[PDB]
């Protein structure tokens, strides 16, 4: 029994999940067990991973283009995954997140931040990640931060349940 397959209602739901390389995004995709990850290379050096099961679709790429903006406009949910143990690159994660949120095509996207790798000893917790990313500053933005360990699965249901509920009841 796959807990994610009935988590997104029955209407079309499109989610874009991005983040710096090594944040844990591909790990999350596999954990959903929603089918084969299809990799496309729309242009050399731009790798896109897609998972689709019935009404739910995840699109994934690393950050850090015209095609990006066409992916944006159809995006209802935006997930930003961050390596909570990588203090050296947390500011870079912030700048990439803020760059995406400045895009008009994502103006109405609901934002879920996965503060990933919470299993590691010296990982910043979700409150610290919230402050380092400046999420309290966000304007006209429906956002949530969820502590996760993608390799164990902890937190993934909780975050996606929050996001799905927001998308289905608004
Ligand atoms: N400790 C820990 N590691 C995690 C967690 N999530 C992902 N990882 C690990 O981090 C590395 C990068 O994950 P990946 O999903 O490839 O990230 P990406 O797709 O965002 O680039 C992988 O290890 P490798 O590259 O070494 O195989 C993966 O196993 C987590 O919650 N905790
Ligand atoms: Mg990857």
Residue numbers in the entry: 6 to 69, 75 to 180
The authors write:
The ADP-ribosylation factors (Arfs) constitute a family of small GTPases within the Ras superfamily, with a distinguishing structural feature of a hypervariable N-terminal extension of the G domain modified with myristate. Arf proteins, including Arf1, have roles in membrane trafficking and cytoskeletal dynamics. Arf function depends on cycling between GDP- and GTP-bound states. Different than other families of GTPases, intrinsic exchange rates and GTPase rates of Arf proteins are slow or negligible, and they therefore depend on guanine nucleotide exchange factors (GEFs) and GTPase-activating proteins (GAPs) for activity.
Here, we solved the crystal structure of the non-myristoylated engineered Arf1 mutant, [L8K]Arf1, bound to a GDP analogue (G3D). This mutant was previously generated to remove the requirement for a membrane surface for GTP/GDP exchange. There is only a single monomer of [L8K]Arf1 in the crystal asymmetric unit, with residues 6–180 visible in the structure; in addition to residues 2–5, part of switch II (residues 70–74) was too disordered to be modeled. The macromolecule is clearly bound to a magnesium ion as well as a guanine nucleotide that was initially thought to be GDP, but was later determined to be G3D, a GDP molecule with a phosphate in the 3’ position. The most striking difference between the WT and [L8K] structures is in the positioning of their N-terminal residues; while both structures exhibit amphipathic helices that occlude the hydrophobic cavity where the myristoyl group is typically found in the native protein (see next section), the helices are offset by 6.5 Å (L8Cα to K8Cα). Further, the hinge region between the N-terminal helix and β1 is approximately 7.1 Å (K16Cα-Cα) more extended in the WT structure than in the [L8K] structure. Another difference between the structures is the interswitch region, which in the [L8K] structure moves approximately 2.4 Å (based on averaged Cα-Cα distances of K59 and N60) towards the cavity compared to the WT structure. Examination of the location of the L8K mutation revealed that this residue, while located inside the hydrophobic cavity in the non-myristoylated WT structure as L8, is instead found outside of the hydrophobic cavity when mutated to lysine. Interestingly, the N-terminal shift as a result of the L8K mutation is also achieved by redundancies in the N-terminal sequence of Arf1—while the hydrophobic cavity in the WT structure is filled by residues F5, L8, F9, L12, and partly M18, the cavity in the [L8K] structure is instead filled by F9, L12, F13, and M18 to a greater degree. The crystal structure of non-myristoylated [L8K]Arf1•G3D extends our understanding of the N-terminus of Arf in that we find that the single residue mutation significantly changes the mechanism of binding.
